Amino acid sequence: MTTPSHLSDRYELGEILGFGGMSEVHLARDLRDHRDVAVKVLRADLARDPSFYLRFRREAQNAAALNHPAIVAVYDTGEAETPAGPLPYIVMEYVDGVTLRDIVHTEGPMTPKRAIEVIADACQALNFSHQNGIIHRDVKPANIMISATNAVKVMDFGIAIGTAQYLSPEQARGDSVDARSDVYSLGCVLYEVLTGEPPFTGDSPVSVAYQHVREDPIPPSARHEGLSADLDAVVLKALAKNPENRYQTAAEMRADLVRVHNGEPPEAPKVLTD
Numbered sequence: 001m002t003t004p005s006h007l008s009d010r011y012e013l014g015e016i017l018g019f020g021g022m023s024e025v026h027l028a029r030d031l032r033d034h035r036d037v038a039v040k041v042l043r044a045d046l047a048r049d050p051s052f053y054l055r056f057r058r059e060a061q062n063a064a065a066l067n068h069p070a071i072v073a074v075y076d077t078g079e080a081e082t083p084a085g086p087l088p089y090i091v092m093e094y095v096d097g098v099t100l101r102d103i104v105h106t107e108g109p110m111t112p113k114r115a116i117e118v119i120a121d122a123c124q125a126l127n128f129s130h131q132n133g134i135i136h137r138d139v140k141p142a143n144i145m146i147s148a149t150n151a152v153k154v155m156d157f158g159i160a161i162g163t164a165q166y167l168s169p170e171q172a173r174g175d176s177v178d179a180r181s182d183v184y185s186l187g188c189v190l191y192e193v194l195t196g197e198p199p200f201t202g203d204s205p206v207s208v209a210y211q212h213v214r215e216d217p218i219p220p221s222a223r224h225e226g227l228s229a230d231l232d233a234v235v236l237k238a239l240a241k242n243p244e245n246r247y248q249t250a251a252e253m254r255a256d257l258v259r260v261h262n263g264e265p266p267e268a269p270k271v272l273t274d
């Protein structure tokens with residue numbers, strides 16, 4: 001039962017842009033500051049459920065505020081009073097565009113050069129985040145948008161619904177996560193934009209986590225054609241089980257992708273098929 005037409009006598013809501021497991025996101029006009037913004041509101045249909053309300057206040061509303069061209073900026077948080085009860089929200093940079101989850105669904109895999117470019121920009125966002133002490137912690141296709149003018153925008157950093165499909169082996173065992181955990185999860189995203197499939201699927205979330213821990217990904221070139229062995233090398237280094245065997249920074253990952261984009265050999269160890 002509905003999201004109001006206005007929040008805090010300031011954000012006039014327009015069209016709905018999207019939804020997830022917790023939120024509905026609306027295009028709005030900020031009447032104070034004269035800005036188009038995206039307002040993430042607790043889903044109307046879940047808003048009275050204690051567990052979702054409390055998760056929204058703890059998680060979504062505590063998205064990190066970072067200032068980088070490839071990071072969706074966070075402007076504000078608040079809570080509206082409705083006759084149904086409190087409706088919490090977070091106000092952020094409006095991206096006119098779609099998520100990688102959307103793109104992979106509607107178009108299937110990207111050309112390898114596009115995929116490289118997109119993930120290379122995503123590396124720049126993560127490296128900025130990491131230099132400001134913030135680990136993303138939920139790198140996944142739904143958290144990366146491409147704009148109408150083809151800019152890459154990463155969102156929802158630093159938060160403690162959603163899928164084991166992208167978690168690092170260390171998150172699968174509830175351990176310490178660092179920059180290399182972000183690298184692995186971006187590795188998963190890269191695999192999916194290249195092949196159309198994530199590295200691991202399963203009947204359950206505990207089944208996919210098991211595969212992250214114990215099972216080698218099928219090399220990208222085996223799952224989809226037109227993908228070089230140099231691309232296998234970079235993807236499978238990012239996807240290494242031991243953090244010490246992965247790219248140690250997002251910058252180091254980007255550098256290998258830049259080599260491959262330029263037709264240079266990557267520094268990652270060779271992977272042999274067939």
Ligand SMILES: Nc1ncnc2c1ncn2[C@@H]1O[C@H](COP(=O)(O)OP(=O)(O)OP(O)(O)=S)[C@@H](O)[C@H]1O
Binds near residue numbers: 021025093
């Ligand atoms: N800043 C943004 N600008 C434009 N659209 C956005 C923006 N952020 C989110 N969206 C759209 O709204 C959708 C839902 O946002 P999500 O962050 O995935 O939802 P959520 O419910 O808070 O997250 P989980 O991960 O599902 S619990 C996205 O898939 C986009 O379609």
